[PDB]
Amino acid sequence: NVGSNTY
Amino acid sequence: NVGSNTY
Amino acid sequence: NVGSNTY
Amino acid sequence: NVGSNTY
Amino acid sequence: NVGSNTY
Amino acid sequence: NVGSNTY
């Protein structure tokens, strides 16, 4: 993955 | 958040 | 959120 | 995945 | 997936 | 957050 962020 | 994961 | 995951 | 974010 | 975000 | 992991 590239940049599957969780906030 | 609780357990908002990215796979 | 609770358990809003991305697959 | 690319950028399936969770907020 | 690309960018199936969850808010 | 509690246990928002990235895989």
Side-chain angles (χ1 to χ4, degrees), chain B:
Chain B
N1 287 347
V2 175
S4 292
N5 302 281
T6 69
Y7 296 89

Side-chain angles (χ1 to χ4, degrees), chain F:
Chain F
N1 287 347
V2 175
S4 292
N5 302 281
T6 69
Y7 296 89

Side-chain angles (χ1 to χ4, degrees), chain C:
Chain C
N1 287 347
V2 175
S4 292
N5 302 281
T6 69
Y7 296 89

